[PDB]
Design a protein around this ligand. Sequence first.
Ligand SMILES: Nc1nc2c(ncn2[C@@H]2O[C@H](COP(=O)(O)OP(=O)(O)OP(=O)(O)O)[C@@H](O)[C@H]2O)c(=O)[nH]1
Ligand SMILES: [Mg+2]
Ligand SMILES: [Mg+2]
Ligand SMILES: [Mg+2]
Ligand SMILES: [Mg+2]
Ligand SMILES: [Mg+2]
Ligand SMILES: [Mg+2]
Length: 141
Amino acid sequence: SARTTPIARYRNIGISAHIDAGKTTTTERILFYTGVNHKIGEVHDGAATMDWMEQEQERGITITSAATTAFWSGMAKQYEPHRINIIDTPGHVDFTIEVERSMRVLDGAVMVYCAVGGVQPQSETVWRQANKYKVPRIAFV
RNA sequence: GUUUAGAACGUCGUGAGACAGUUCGGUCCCUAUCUGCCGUGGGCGCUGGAGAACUGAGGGGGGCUGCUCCUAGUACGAGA
Ligand SMILES: Nc1nc2c(ncn2[C@@H]2O[C@H](COP(=O)(O)OP(=O)(O)OP(=O)(O)O)[C@@H](O)[C@H]2O)c(=O)[nH]1
Ligand SMILES: [Mg+2]
Ligand SMILES: [Mg+2]
Ligand SMILES: [Mg+2]
Ligand SMILES: [Mg+2]
Ligand SMILES: [Mg+2]
Ligand SMILES: [Mg+2]
């Protein structure tokens, strides 16, 4: 019953953005690259793993906050396998509670942004929710 | 179906009968002369006669559209 991964190698990251900014797409790609999934499933095809719930495969949105983990070592494997507990949160204003609950406990965040339209009405809302809890965040255009 | 002759009901009439009342049953002919049209030939013409290949003035035919997929979850839209 020893420590499998050192606690310094943990990353409690999570995704928050405006609707259709590409949160679920990034997580799907992560899982695939890290080896958790064996295929890439698109969200508008209903085949993304993070949108597990029906009315999420049908409508094409994310409603709940689903938490998974993965092991990433770097491109050229520059470090030991770090464990990332990535969390995909919905970007809609109808589910702001699903961001705040997930950003209560996240150690790090990353604010993904659409390149053609950068800062959208819900981009500012998840930014204020993140700085409420003083979360250190990155940005992925 | 309606629009003959048979019969019956309801109704009307003393009655024969009658009802845009309703019921059952009840003969639909024509070998195409002309025009028209569809085809298919004969004659003559086109200026010596003939065999072929053509040009195109003109005429006719034809012209319908669904559903998916890509563009693209792109434009628009806070979102949907
Ligand atoms: N051209 C292009 N389309 C992308 C890209 N990333 C995502 N999309 C499309 O945008 C939609 C994905 O947006 P999502 O990330 O699934 O929605 P979300 O950001 O996870 O957040 P919620 O809607 O609240 O659940 C799909 O149609 C994607 O194919 C990209 O990098 N380039
Ligand atoms: Mg858009
Ligand atoms: Mg959508
Ligand atoms: Mg999503
Ligand atoms: Mg005549
Ligand atoms: Mg013509
Ligand atoms: Mg599409």
